[PDB]
Design a protein around this ligand. Sequence first.
Ligand code: ZN
Ligand code: ZN
Lengths: 138, 138
Amino acid sequence: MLSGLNHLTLAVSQLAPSVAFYQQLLGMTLHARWDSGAYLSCGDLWLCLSLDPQRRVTPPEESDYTHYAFSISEADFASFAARLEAAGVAVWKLNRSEGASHYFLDPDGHKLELHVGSLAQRLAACREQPYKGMVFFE
Amino acid sequence: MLSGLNHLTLAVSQLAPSVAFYQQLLGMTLHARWDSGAYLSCGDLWLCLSLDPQRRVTPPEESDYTHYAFSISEADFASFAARLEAAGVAVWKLNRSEGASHYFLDPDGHKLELHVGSLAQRLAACREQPYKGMVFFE
Ligand SMILES: [Zn+2]
Ligand SMILES: [Zn+2]
């Protein structure tokens, strides 16, 4: 069977500002970089940044809801979100429609998120406050 | 500070064919569905499919290299690739890198991959044969 995300590859227009964002600002571990990409890790996540001349910025209102959420503890969530805000990182969504989340953009307009909680916790919360028409499968 | 990938959300244009693709063809576990989305899991990956009228079925030549790779064992790789081929699933790239990889498209054109191998394995191969401009960080 398939089991797990092996890696997430993000196309980037400029490699150095992207590496700086993920390593310096988000605190991910940089393992290697080369003329056309970089490999970082975030816990078990393998992140590849790939220099792509085809990557364009799109303002968030003109891209779809595809997005990438990173786990953070309840104790660190608010202060890290506030640090991103204070550093001028743009926000793309304010309404918390899926629990405790902060929604921010990377330098290339990729839609990112900080989230507190697992899938099991989300399902348990949704049993009490379900999305419209929600059905649960055991 | 960040501990890993919390969830991957893919915007979809039609919920039913996307659920069929990820649950039935790819074998992910469906945990819940609502009028505008679904939650699935694939190993430790929490996948959300989100119905979005902004999502377009996008040919691969019209999107950048951003993509999502799922882990599969070497032993299972060939039969799973054959399953995708039997289902008529389009391929967007041929593999030219270390470790088995199959590059395929979802119903909306999201770029997916099956990959055999870890970040550690990739780094070991790169240390032996570094890419142009490659620098490592310990
Ligand atoms: Zn999210
Ligand atoms: Zn890949």
